[PDB]
Amino acid sequence: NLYFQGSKFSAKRLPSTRLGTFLENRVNDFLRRQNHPESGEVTVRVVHASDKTVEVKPGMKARFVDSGEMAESFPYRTKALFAFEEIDGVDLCFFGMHVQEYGSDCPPPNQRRVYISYLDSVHFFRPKCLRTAVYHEILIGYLEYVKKLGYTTGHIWACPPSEGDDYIFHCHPPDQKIPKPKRLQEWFKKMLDKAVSERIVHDYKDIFKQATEDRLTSAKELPYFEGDFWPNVLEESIKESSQKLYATMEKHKEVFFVIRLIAGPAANSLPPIVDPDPLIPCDLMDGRDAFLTLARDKHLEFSSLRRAQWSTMCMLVELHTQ
Ligand SMILES: CC(C)(COP(=O)(O)OP(=O)(O)OC[C@H]1O[C@@H](n2cnc3c(N)ncnc32)[C@H](O)[C@@H]1OP(=O)(O)O)[C@@H](O)C(=O)NCCC(=O)NCCS
Ligand SMILES: Cc1[nH]c2ccccc2c1-c1ncc(C(F)(F)F)cc1Cl
């Protein structure tokens, strides 16, 4: 075999991580209990991990940071992970997700939280009848894994991409339907209800219920995440001027899930979060832009199985080499 088409550049030979091994073990265990003949071995790899900070934007800084009520910035670790399936000997990249992990050495209100910035997929998983179930196993495992390290809360924003935009994979298949907000909200509910039944998630609530239950009064109590809706909405509210906050939360409450992983009394005694995986510098996978940019420029579409496999191979070579 030619050098770049050799096994050295396969998904499997990408460096292993504790998180990657955990997710894939869980996915392949679910797959072996199904005993479906056309399914292939799944590989999950964390391909980027780096320390970042999210600084509070000027309006909120003015109101809350200079007055001493709120830290000016929050440290977090961003991770990029991808799921691959071998389809009769060929690696296919079918799912990806970037997350933001705010640890125990982080000020409130962001302490011990994970945020799913971006998630995306391409619908060639074989067999197609286990596709949704596998996406759910990955998400559930992610939540279980971070619970076990000592993250207490998770945060999901269910916004589908506007028509024609791609979140991670350049050029989806034209026959891959994009769900409307309702269908996506239900999809997340189904996943979370399964996580709840496994006693991974204690419970979840939309942001309006949660705020009510928390008797939240100030905007400084909201988690402040990189690239999220809510920091832009507050800069919008400040530049032009609790009545307007709750009103805005109620309005978008279906779209934002607060996921409680560790509950009440247990969440105060927690030891410090120790992440046993290393940092993994990889500029290609530092947020979603770099990979969209490369794939646009080099014409690496994910728009058919065969384009997706070529695109996957180029992706892999690049991760192995940078
Ligand atoms: C989120 C995502 C992984 C869900 O994939 P999934 O498990 O296949 O579930 P979907 O809701 O997309 O599809 C399930 C079914 O609903 C159908 N469906 C999806 N959108 C539809 C629409 N607008 N109208 C009718 N049917 C639709 C699909 O065709 C599919 O039918 P099938 O099961 O018979 O094949 C995928 O839709 C996706 O990658 N979306 C873009 C990324 C994203 O939305 N991220 C948001 C959070 S950051
Ligand atoms: C800011 C933000 N960004 C999000 C992104 C995804 C999911 C949830 C949130 C939230 C949120 N989290 C907690 C509360 C609450 F607990 F205070 F109610 C309120 C809010 Cl709006």
Numbering used by the authors: 1280 to 1520, 1581 to 1661
Extract from the study:
P300 is an ∼2400AA multidomain protein whose catalytic core consists of bromo-, RING, PHD, and histone acetyltransferase (HAT) domains. By acetylating histones, p300 promotes gene expression. It can also acetylate itself, as well as other proteins, and recruit a larger complex of proteins including transcription factors. The overall structure is as expected from previous p300-HAT structures: a central β-sheet is composed of seven β-strands and surrounded by nine α-helices.
To improve homogeneity, a construct omitting the autoacetylation-prone autoinhibitory loop was inactivated through mutation of residue Y1467 to F: p300‐HAT‐YF‐Δloop [K1287‐Q1663/Y1467F/Δ(L1520‐L1580)] and overexpressed in E. coli. Ternary crystals of p300‐HAT‐YF‐Δloop with CoA and CPI-090 were obtained at 4° C from 200 + 150 nl sitting drops with a 60 μL reservoir consisting of 0.1 M CHES pH 9.5 and 30% w/v PEG 3000 [MCSG1 (MCSG) (purchased from Anatrace), condition A2]. Followup with dynamic scanning fluorimetry (DSF) of the P300-HAT domain indicated strong stabilization, especially for CPI-090. Despite their chemical differences, these new allosteric compounds bind in the same location, ∼8 Å distant from the active site, between the α5 and α6 helices. There are few structural differences between these ternary compound/CoA/HAT structures and CoA/HAT binary structures. Essentially, the allosteric compounds displace water molecules. However, derivatization failed to improve the compound activity from this starting point (data not shown). The indole compound CPI-090, a stronger HAT inhibitor at 0.31 μM, offered vectors for optimization from the 4, 5, and 6 positions of its pyridine ring [Fig. 6(b)]. Derivatization yielded actionable SAR and improvement in the biochemical activity (data not shown), and so this series was selected for cell-based assays. CPI-090 does not inhibit the FL enzyme in our experiments.
